[PDB]
Amino acid sequence: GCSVSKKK
Amino acid sequence: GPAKTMEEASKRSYQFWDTQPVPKLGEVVNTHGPVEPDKDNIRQEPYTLPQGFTWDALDLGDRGVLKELYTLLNENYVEDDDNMFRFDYSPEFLLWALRPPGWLPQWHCGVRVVSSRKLVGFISAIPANIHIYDTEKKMVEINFLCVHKKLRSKRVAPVLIREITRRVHLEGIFQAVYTAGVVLPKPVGTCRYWHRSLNPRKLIEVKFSHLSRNMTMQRTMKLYRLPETPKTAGLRPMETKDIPVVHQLLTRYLKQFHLTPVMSQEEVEHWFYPQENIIDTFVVENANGEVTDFLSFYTLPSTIMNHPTHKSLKAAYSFYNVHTQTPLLDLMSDALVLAKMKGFDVFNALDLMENKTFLEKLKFGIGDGNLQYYLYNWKCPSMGAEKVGLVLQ
Ligand SMILES: CC(C)(COP(=O)(O)OP(=O)(O)OC[C@H]1O[C@@H](n2cnc3c(N)ncnc32)[C@H](O)[C@@H]1OP(=O)(O)O)[C@@H](O)C(=O)NCCC(=O)NCCS
Ligand SMILES: *C(=O)CCCCCCCCCCCCC
Which residue of B has its CA nearest to A4? Predict the structure, then answer.
């Protein structure tokens, strides 16, 4: 599966 | 529990993955080839599920079944590390991702509650020809592994993985490629997501990003402002007549990387021909009428969990971008403008292929989410992100 990233 | 970092992962014992034909996290790999030989007799019976649950292959051509899968993923699929955003793949996107050329119904592997028929688990495989260093192999790509929140920590994911493995083995395929946000034995490459703000006000309000202490909202909005129209001469949406040249451009462009797909012309049509709210591809047709470049990005929103006002984050994801006459920086600048025009809040890209050459210059900020790349039953040396040339949805 893909992964959910947000801004560091 | 799962491990997000190599630090955490060194402390784990992997009761399931130790049983699988993948290298151990500690070892370095100095060879190239299968972990174990191909099997000449395959288990004919499905693996046993816990009591009260049954296998069911999902016909995604039935709109109601597709909507059940939509709902399972919408409520139970991947979240960010802070449980603030969850993927919201659309039904039409799922059809795109799950019925490419060569798709098989038995590789859409669902789990239902026996009494209620509720869909509580899923995993999928699609066929792909994969080039890894000096070898080209028919593999599958595994995607959408999902266990309902209530069914978790009951060892259902290992059963889903073993069952899809069995169903792929029955078709004579013994290698797979897949990604994960967590560290497992054993990544062939590690990528990092980066994010280019397009609607910074919303991104800050929903806490996808934050104001960097010494910047104001007004400064942040001016920082990320974009032109109204793209600048590259001859940029236009991909059309049917462009399928051969997009295939040619992509094939030649990918030779420089070490992990890449090998697409037929029919796969190129599937993965790149524009579909509104799923996949956008724009080509550069020059003054001689030749297509020399193309950019592409797919549409994948996230649910904004537990938020009273903003419910969805509209995200565009960089797909494959091929440059031969237009500089990659200019190409990606135009992708940003197009995504802004289409109403996206953020434009996401990994640090793979040549993306590092433009990420900082185009004002992307690093993310908190890794994307690990894995091969099943294939031993090879790991590679840096710049040599990964494969993007999975
Ligand atoms: C990831 C998910 C499917 C795991 O289901 P689960 O209820 O936690 O199943 P269990 O933890 O009891 O099974 C444990 C095995 O599954 C492995 N596993 C956990 N997450 C995995 C993942 N994303 N991919 C492959 N294997 C995974 C575990 O590493 C463990 O193997 P190990 O003993 O060698 O470490 C489930 O948490 C889920 O649906 N999460 C949201 C969607 C998601 O993250 N999908 C996969 C993205 S890669
Ligand atoms: C994202 O959802 C990926 C989850 C991957 C789970 C592990 C898959 C391991 C490979 C199984 C198929 C092997 C076929 C030879």
Answer: B80
